[PDB]
Amino acid sequence: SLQNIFRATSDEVRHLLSCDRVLVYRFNPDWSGEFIHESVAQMWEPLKDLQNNFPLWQDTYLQENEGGRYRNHESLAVGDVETAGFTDCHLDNLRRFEIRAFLTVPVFVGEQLWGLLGAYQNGAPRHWQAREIHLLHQIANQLGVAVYQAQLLARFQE
Ligand SMILES: *[C@@H](C)[C@H]1/C(=C/c2[nH]c(/C=C3N=C(/C=C4/NC(=O)C(CC)=C4C)C(C)=C\3CCC(=O)O)c(CCC(=O)O)c2C)NC(=O)[C@@H]1C
Ligand SMILES: O=S(=O)(O)C[C@@H](O)CNC1CCCCC1
Ligand code: NA
Ligand code: NA
Ligand code: NA
Numbered sequence: 001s002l003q004n005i006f007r008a009t010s011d012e013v014r015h016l017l018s019c020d021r022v023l024v025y026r027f028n029p030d031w032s033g034e035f036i037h038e039s040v041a042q043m044w045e046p047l048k049d050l051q052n053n054f055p056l057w058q059d060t061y062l063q064e065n066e067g068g069r070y071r072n073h074e075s076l077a078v079g080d081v082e083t084a085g086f087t088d089c090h091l092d093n094l095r096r097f098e099i100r101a102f103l104t105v106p107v108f109v110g111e112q113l114w115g116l117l118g119a120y121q122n123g124a125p126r127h128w129q130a131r132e133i134h135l136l137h138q139i140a141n142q143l144g145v146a147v148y149q150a151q152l153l154a155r156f157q158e
Helices: 002-017 047-051 068-072 088-096 130-155
Strands: 021-027 033-040 076-078 099-109 112-122
Touching (some): 002 021, 002 112, 002 130, 033 047, 068 099, 088 099, 099 130, 112 130
Antiparallel strands (some): 021 033
16 A cells, blocks of 8 residues: 555655655654654664664654754755764764664655655765755655545545
8 A cells, every 4th residue: 555655756866865764753743753664774673673682872853843954845865973063862872773873854745844755874984966856855745646636536535
């Protein structure tokens, strides 16, 4: 349904970026959220297993700030988490999952922030390129459309 769409999308980013993990995050109406889909290289445990054994610092930032920078269509592009100046808790979280560089972009459904699309590299910093960021935005835009049109089709319910 939307599941094979998330799967197709997540696998597409992972291959085009040759990264370690790709995640789709979905917001709730109160701006809490969760990761609802992953594509991950064979090397690494699924997120869900990590989450069940490897505790994290609580992270309520996005929720408290109703989507944070994503709300204004901004993205995060991080070549090295170790030099980025994150809070200690955020770095410690990223470190727990061996994330060393990542990209995170907004996903808009209609004109509302629906989620995030994240791409992660473990173990070594990255020199992200503009065309990689551009392609990630294109994919994120297409995902938004797909979800938007699946909502419209649901709305068609008689
Ligand atoms: C320390 C934890 C303080 C805090 C910091 C903070 N966190 C964010 C943004 C995100 N936090 C996310 C949650 C997770 N949960 C995971 O399991 C995981 C590994 C895949 C992550 C990355 C999350 C998805 C985001 C958005 C992307 C990101 O990592 O930034 C921010 C906003 C940063 C910005 O500049 O946009 C801050 C400041 N959260 C807290 O509650 C502590 C006070
Ligand atoms: O910029 S905001 O007001 O959205 C969010 C604020 O928590 C800043 N996050 C810093 C930004 C720079 C990299 C290290 C993390
Ligand atoms: Na988590
Ligand atoms: Na931080
Ligand atoms: Na992320």
